[PDB]
Design a binder for this molecule. Structure first.
Ligand SMILES: [Ca+2]
Ligand SMILES: [Ca+2]
Length: 341
DNA sequence: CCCAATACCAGTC
DNA sequence: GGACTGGTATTGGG
């Protein structure tokens, strides 16, 4: 199999830079502002000038400003980044039938039918980078390899504005010499628990008692890392199909009183429904974040689709349920729809 | 046997 | 989490 992975570089920041040419060469930090005290919020993404000084995705805005007091800080404009992204995914589609959109800024393509070898794939990758650059002024990184997992790794190695092939010889090599925390689907929490068993490389997952690795990171990530280590990871590129749609808003001030919490809850419902796109969900979960940032939720599944009005009344009852099984106050309230018809 | 339905948990931008 | 979306570990039945 020949897999071509496409990953847009510092995407949210780069779109901001393309729309606003007076930001290029400056450190740029795209932020999600919570609207509570000023500068309350996290960093969604920052460009590569800003990453050099340690401003990265996930850190609080106030923390970022402890490093780059004079970076440009911009409100996340998700809907804008989504238009651009959609247009770029359409470009990719002219290159292959078999395409898997993995997120707002990555797609895997199966080009086995379109090319005969890795050298032809490289030449297609370049074709793609230039198409995207010409039509959208967006730089991307490309990875090419035997499967999805290693196509992505190849991209994580060549970013930004890069392209890399990991051939059959380097795959064996990489299975030996490559930190396990650079393995897609392995974050701090998993890269942590594995760091205390000695397991520091993929290959290490083969010397440990299975049941122990299992009893350590679950039967999913074990079989996953093992299959990667045996070099027998075989997942096909398939169309991804959104399985849920939701909205979770931060409220002005905390609360534990049902009356202020709507709208948004109610705003969250109306916003989600416009994102539903005449998709009809059969399940609904009301989602609450308390004071200490812990997540509590209650849900219900109907034998039929949920109308917009039904969502309203059923979420209040789901809201009330939460209210009297957790005494603490609500910082953020939202809703989540799933099991579509 | 699933698996469905129910939540709390993990990776990503 | 921000704010999303999947994953994931219980459970309750057929
Ligand atoms: Ca990406
Ligand atoms: Ca990116």
């Amino acid at each position: 199999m020949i897999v071509l992975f496409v990953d847009f570089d510092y995407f949210y920041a780069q779109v901001e830079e393309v729309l606003n040419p007076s930001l290029k060469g400056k450190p740029v930090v795209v932020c999600v502002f919570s609207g509570r005290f000023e500068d309350s919020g996290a960093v969604a993404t920052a460009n590569y000038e800003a990453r050099k000084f340690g401003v990265k995705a996930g850190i609080p805005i106030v923390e970022a400003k402890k490093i780059l007091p004079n970076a440009v800080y911009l409100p996340m404009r998700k809907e804008v980044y989504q238009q651009v992204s959609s247009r770029i995914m359409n470009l990719l589609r002219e290159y292959s039938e078999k395409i898997e959109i993995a997120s707002i800024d990555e797609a895997y393509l199966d080009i086995s039918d379109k090319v005969r070898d890795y050298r032809e794939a490289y030449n297609l990758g370049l074709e793609i980078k230039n198409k995207i650059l010409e039509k959208e002024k967006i730089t991307v990184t490309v990875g090419i390899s035997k499967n999805k997992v290693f196509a992505k790794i190849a991209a994580d190695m060549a970013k930004p504005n890069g392209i890399k092939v990991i051939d059959d010889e380097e795959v064996k090599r990489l299975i030996r010499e490559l930190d396990i925390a650079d393995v897609p689907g392995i974050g701090n929490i998993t890269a942590e628990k594995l760091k205390k068993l000695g397991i520091n490389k993929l290959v290490d997952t083969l010397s440990i008692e299975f049941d122990k690795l299992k009893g350590m990171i679950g039967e999913a990530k074990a079989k996953y890392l093992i299959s990667l280590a045996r070099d027998e990871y075989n997942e096909p590129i398939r169309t991804r199909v959104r399985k849920s749609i939701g909205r979770i808003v931060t409220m002005k001030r905390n609360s534990r009183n049902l009356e202020e919490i709507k709208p948004y809850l109610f705003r969250a419902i109306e916003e989600s429904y416009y994102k539903l796109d005449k998709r009809i969900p059969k399940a609904i979960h009301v989602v609450a974040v308390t004071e200490d940032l812990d997540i509590v939720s209650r849900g219900r599944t109907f034998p039929h689709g949920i109308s917009k009005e039904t969502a309203y009344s059923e979420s209040v009852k789901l809201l009330q349920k939460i209210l009297e099984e957790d005494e603490r106050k609500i910082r953020r309230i939202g809703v989540r729809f799933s099991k579509f018809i």
